[PDB]
Design a protein around this nucleic acid. Sequence first.
DNA 1: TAGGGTTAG
Length: 183
Amino acid sequence: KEPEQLRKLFIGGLSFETTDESLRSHFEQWGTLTDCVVMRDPNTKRSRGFGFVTYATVEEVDAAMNARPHKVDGRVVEPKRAVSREDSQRPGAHLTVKKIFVGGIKEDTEEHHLRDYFEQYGKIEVIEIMTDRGSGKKRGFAFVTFDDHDSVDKIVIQKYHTVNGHNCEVRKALSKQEMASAS
DNA sequence: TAGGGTTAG
């Protein structure tokens, strides 16, 4: 049994009339669920438009993700990798992006080092090892872009990532403006 | 479209 958090998916944009029932009936197509709930307001008991589904294996959730789009109760919904309550705390951790910030890479780090490790998550579109302006000095971090936003999510949820022989930190990419709003 | 009486004795 892999971790619960890694076996659950967040389902967004659910139709107001979606119930654990319907939710379950749909996603069981890709495997055995072990949890399936529609979140709603404690008082009006009215749906909040989102819910979670959990399978018995991460392999099965991978199967479901490869199955997008997902239409439930006549409404295209949006499945995502469930982000731990704790990380949901972090600045813009729920936004949908295709680019990732990779911090703490060695000076001799080259592009192949990043491809080496990152390709296993999805089609890479761009790699950028940031250097200093006019200085040309390596800055110890980079940006990697993918075709699927899920490739990024499949990553940010893992805790460790080894690039060029050592662990490095990975976070969703935020625009210069988002950074400032965060700070 | 970010969690269910689920976070410091």
